[PDB]
Design a binder for this molecule. Structure first.
Ligand SMILES: CC(=O)N[C@H]1[C@H]([C@H](O)[C@H](O)CO)O[C@@](O)(C(=O)O)C[C@@H]1O
Ligand SMILES: CC(=O)N[C@H]1[C@H]([C@H](O)[C@H](O)CO)O[C@@](O)(C(=O)O)C[C@@H]1O
Length: 586
């Protein structure tokens, strides 16, 4: 026990630590090497050579015990490999061939070198190295035999044979490989177990996403680690892959080079990619949808409703001018489009993972664009364009947190981005700037996917400059173009109806129109008020082509290009139909 305590219990978890030595050279040492039993050398004065021989026998024999206890419950092949890899480190480290440093690795190295400088009375480093190599050659047999003396019956007969002498890195690359593949299995098994086939959108929930992301971080670490182990082999072998050691190692696993060695297989994406978010996002940013508008328009209902959205109802909702938001922003009217802006539900927002929130926002941005395209599919490109921008701008204000509505799912969008913010300073002005910056980092991508549903993608200009326009102002225009459009429609309805009767209950058609125009009149008044009251407060000083409400509409509202704002416009019946709505006796 006196010897076992000197070393210390081994950590079952297999991990490779990567530091940089005094030569600015990055190296990756296995945890097994770090805990290599070498403390006994320090607890002994090492009086004579025979004493050194004795302590060494204890060092290796003790190493076997702790390794055995370490691998209780594991595959016996591990205990076999670790014995051989540790015995190899006892050699390599003892003959000057070592990458590991710090701690007792150098504290024992220096001591051993010093005692050997006293034993042989030789202080030449190179000479000593040879002396030690010769000593090992003549003591390696007795060391190995004594190392596995109490564990011969716990390893295969083939493992009982003394390990072949090889360079340290040659053995570390081998060991690291077995640890990599072994760990890659376990992790991927948990993926299959939790993701199944990802046909029921398992990859969109923690159950499958967590193990998938755990596998991801493992591949990232593994790659960087092997990149080092790779460079060290080349460097130690004259910058050459001598004996095609690496080239072979790659083909042994059916891979070409490092890059391909970590290239996520098609299988992974099929199980870890939320098919109603990631799959489409990739299609819009890289795949078919990116270029083909027809493909970017085709909607997948299952994925749509899986995300938490639905087709824009054929019906038309009235502009909300009596929401709770009106309390702080009186006069504002929420566009029906905004009332149904696709934000989704999902599990990505909750956790607060930057990439997950990004994956969701893009998902919503896409669906929104698709649904709009499916609704206003019969509108010109110039019109459809401004419609996409209207939502793109709303999204911006929702993220930034400058949205006027602050609806349930609206806040959820903002507040969930605050969860992504791991900063501990959480005041309004602080959380604001954070989101505002985060938007600038992704606003370009958000637009790329949304603009993918337009025949000519570069028809929409100043989409970003449009977002910088105050929300209310953007809506007041949308209301103008809307009202004017539906006005022309209702006028065409009268012309098409008047002639129908002219050849072969006018009060009814009118009555319906009388109630409509009155409703639109109040929506016009509420906004016009806010526009004037806000103008006097000097809120729109930093806005060109703005510094009368009715006038502001004409120029901007392209639809109202042939309409003036008199008192006649809000009459119970059009001027040309004023006398016609009257005399309904006919
Ligand atoms: C200093 C050094 O290089 N190795 C020593 C390690 C490490 O200090 C820590 O385990 C993590 O660094 O700890 C030991 O107590 C142990 O693992 O049994 C002894 C060993 O000699
Ligand atoms: C709350 C919100 O802004 N938009 C949501 C809307 C609104 O709840 C309704 O349209 C009523 O306003 O409903 C959805 O189910 C939908 O349109 O597919 C999801 C969408 O995210």
């Amino acid at each position: 026990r006196t010897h076992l305590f000197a070393c210390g219990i081994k950590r079952k978890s297999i991990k490779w630590i990567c530091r940089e030595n005094s030569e600015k050279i990055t190296v990756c040492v296995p945890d097994r090497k770090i805990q290599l039993c070498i403390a006994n050398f320090l607890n002994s004065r090492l009086e004579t050579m025979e004493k050194f021989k004795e302590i060494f026998l204890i060092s290796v024999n003790t190493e076997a015990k702790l390794l055995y206890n370490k691998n209780e419950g594991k595959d016996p092949s591990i205990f076999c490999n670790e014995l051989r890899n540790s015995f190899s480190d006892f050699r390599n480290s003892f003959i000057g061939d070592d990458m590991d440093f710090g701690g007792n690795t150098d504290r024992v190295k220096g001591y051993i070198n010093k005692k050997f400088s006293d034993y042989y009375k030789e202080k030449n480093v190179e000479k000593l190295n040879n002396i030690k190599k010769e000593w090992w050659e003549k003591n390696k047999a007795n060391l190995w035999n004594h190392m596995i003396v109490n564990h011969k019956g716990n390893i295969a007969k083939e493992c009982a044979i003394i390990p072949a002498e090889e360079p340290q890195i040659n053995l570390w690359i081998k060991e690291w490989n077995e640890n990599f593949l072994m760990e890659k299995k376990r992790l991927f098994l948990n993926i299959k177990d939790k993701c199944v086939e990802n046909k029921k959108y398992e990859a969109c929930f923690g159950g499958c996403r967590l193990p998938c992301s755990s596998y991801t971080s493992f591949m990232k670490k593994s790659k960087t680690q092997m990149e080092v182990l790779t460079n060290l082999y080349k460097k130690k072998n004259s910058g050459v892959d001598k004996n095609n050691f690496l080239n072979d190692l790659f083909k042994k696993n059916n891979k070409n080079d490092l890059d391909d060695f970590f290239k996520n297989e098609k299988e992974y994406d099929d199980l870890c990619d939320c098919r109603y978010t990631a799959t489409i996002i990739k299609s819009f940013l890289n795949g078919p949808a990116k270029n083909d508008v027809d493909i970017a328009s085709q909607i997948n209902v299952n994925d749509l409703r899986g995300f938490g959205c639905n087709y824009k109802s054929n019906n038309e909702k009235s502009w909300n001018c009596a929401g709770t938001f009106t309390n702080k922003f009186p006069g504002t009217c929420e566009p029906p489009r905004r009332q149904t802006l696709c934000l989704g539900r999902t599990y990505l927002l909750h956790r607060g993972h930057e990439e997950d929130y990004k994956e969701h926002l893009l998902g919503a941005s896409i669906y929104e664009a698709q649904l709009l395209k499916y609704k206003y599919k019969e509108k010109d490109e110039n019109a459809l364009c401004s419609i996409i921008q209207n939502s793109y701008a709303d999204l911006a204000d929702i993220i930034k947190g400058s949205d006027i509505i602050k609806d349930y799912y609206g806040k959820k969008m903002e507040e969930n981005l605050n969860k992504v913010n791991k900063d501990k300073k959480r005041n309004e002005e602080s959380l604001k700037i954070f989101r505002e910056k985060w938007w600038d980092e992704n606003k370009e991508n958000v637009w790329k996917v949304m603009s993918a549903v337009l025949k000519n993608k570069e028809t929409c200009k100043d989409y970003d400059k449009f977002q910088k326009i105050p929300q209310f102002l953007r809506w007041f225009k949308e209301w103008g173009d809307d009202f004017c459009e539906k006005r022309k429609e209702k006028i065409y309805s009268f012309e098409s109806f008047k002639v129908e009767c002219k050849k072969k209950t006018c009060k009814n058609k009118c009555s319906e129109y009388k109630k409509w125009i009155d409703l639109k009149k109040s929506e016009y008044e509420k906004q016009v008020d806010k526009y004037t009251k806000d103008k006097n407060k000097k809120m729109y000083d930093n806005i060109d082509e703005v510094k009368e409400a009715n006038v502001y509409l004409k120029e901007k509202s392209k639809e109202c290009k042939d309409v003036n704002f008199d008192d006649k416009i809000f009459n119970e019946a059009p001027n040309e139909y004023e006398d016609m709505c009257k005399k309904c006796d006919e």
